[PDB]
Amino acid sequence: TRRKQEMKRLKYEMEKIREETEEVKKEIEESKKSESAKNLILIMQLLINQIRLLALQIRMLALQL
Amino acid sequence: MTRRKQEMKRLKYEMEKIREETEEVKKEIEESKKRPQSESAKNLILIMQLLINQIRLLALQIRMLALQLQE
Amino acid sequence: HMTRRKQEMKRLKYEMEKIREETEEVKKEIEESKKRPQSESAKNLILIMQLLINQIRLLALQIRMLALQLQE
Amino acid sequence: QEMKRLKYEMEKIREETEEVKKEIEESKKRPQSESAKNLILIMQLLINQIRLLALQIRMLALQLQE
Amino acid sequence: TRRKQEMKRLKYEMEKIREETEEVKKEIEESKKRPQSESAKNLILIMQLLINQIRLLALQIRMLAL
């Protein structure tokens, strides 16, 4: 019983993180109104993609649960 | 049986402690962003936001495995 | 259950296959940037990017594995 | 065979990251620019990640073992 | 059968990844051979952390395979 309740809450926080990640993307998007800035934003886009995969992973793990 | 669960409980605390330290830094980062910063410091803060978000995902992932090992 | 899990699994792998393609385009932009001449700092940025890309790939592999651990 | 290699390779990683952690603390003992401190934060966040991946590995080991 | 073709891709896929990180590692060592600003030294320490993270993921994959 406790496995399902803990699991449900876990997936919930994840979504909130993803949504918190989208606010950053908006700032990244809006912030794109020089080489350093461009290189940094790419890194930020790379980090965000990584966050995307981390979330998919948790979903894959949940499937097994 | 119990030893297997014990190590799983110890490792869970090592995460929880890490989650704490990370959440505190987030607060300090939030306090840095209100006080306007340099154009470079801004991007560095935004990157820190993402890395923090990854830490938290990774903490969720450790709770996931711990469930699966529970059963 | 069986058909919903599969689809949810399929969309996970599918949506994953898009993120990998996105990272590849950035890899080509950076490698053109890697060719052009840039300061020591910018070069190190490029290097840092290349590491990020490589460790995206390993997360992708991890998902592919989990999928197969689910499929089999 | 695989376990020891995995553990040995991991325990080895714990050392190479400690080599990085020492430099940070030595850095922090030296006077820095504001820009530096932001990087030191990033390296601290990065190390936190490494700490967590390491705990995941033990979790995975815990499972497969039994 | 198909899962076997996937392992073929996955084993190769990795070692291609392991070669590229080595390529970055080669640039870090040659980087360190020249005088470096305080910032770029912190950059290097960062990418060394990233390389470590790559090591850990590969182990997870290996352990997920076992």
Side-chain angles (χ1 to χ4, degrees), chain A residues 35 39-40 42-43 46-47 49-50 53 56-57 60-61 63-65, chain C residues 5 8-9 12 16 42 45 49 52 55-56 59 62-63 66-67 70:
Chain A
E35 94 203 283
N39 279 358
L40 292 209
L42 301 213
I43 274 148
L46 281 173
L47 292 184
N49 292 19
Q50 284 205 46
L53 303 172
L56 295 182
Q57 273 198 342
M60 292 292 318
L61 285 188
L63 286 199
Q64 307 185 351
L65 275 178
Chain C
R5 153 174 284 187
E8 169 89 2
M9 165 162 171
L12 288 179
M16 181 210 96
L45 290 199
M49 301 188 219
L52 296 194
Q55 85 184 203
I56 282 171
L59 298 197
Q62 273 187 19
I63 302 186
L66 293 206
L70 269 180

Side-chain angles (χ1 to χ4, degrees), chain B residues 47-48 50-57 59-61:
Chain B
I47 280 175
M48 277 178 257
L50 290 164
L51 297 183
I52 283 153
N53 267 328
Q54 285 182 8
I55 279 176
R56 297 152 62 183
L57 281 162
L60 302 174
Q61 276 198 7

Side-chain angles (χ1 to χ4, degrees), chain C residues 7-9 11-12 16 31 33 37 41-52 54-56 58-63:
Chain C
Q7 295 176 338
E8 169 89 2
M9 165 162 171
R11 169 107 291 206
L12 288 179
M16 181 210 96
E31 259 289 8
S33 297
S41 310
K43 172 203 72 102
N44 281 344
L45 290 199
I46 278 143
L47 279 197
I48 278 169
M49 301 188 219
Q50 196 178 313
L51 298 176
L52 296 194
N54 279 316
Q55 85 184 203
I56 282 171
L58 282 143
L59 298 197
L61 285 170
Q62 273 187 19
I63 302 186

Side-chain angles (χ1 to χ4, degrees), chain E residues 6 8 12-15 17 20-22 24 27-28 31 35-37 40 42-47 49-50 52-54 56-61 63-65:
Chain E
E6 192 38 278
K8 175 84 191 52
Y12 173 83
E13 186 59 37
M14 293 214 54
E15 210 61 16
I17 298 179
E20 308 224 275
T21 74
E22 170 71 17
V24 169
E27 298 236 26
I28 288 164
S31 188
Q36 262 154 209
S37 48
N42 289 338
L43 277 201
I44 293 287
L45 280 187
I46 280 164
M47 45 183 95
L49 282 182
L50 303 180
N52 272 318
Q53 284 176 8
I54 307 204
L56 280 171
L57 301 185
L59 275 205
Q60 265 185 5
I61 286 180
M63 250 189 298
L64 284 186

Side-chain angles (χ1 to χ4, degrees), chain A residues 34-35 37 39-40 42-44 46:
Chain A
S34 44
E35 94 203 283
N39 279 358
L40 292 209
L42 301 213
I43 274 148
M44 284 178 48
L46 281 173

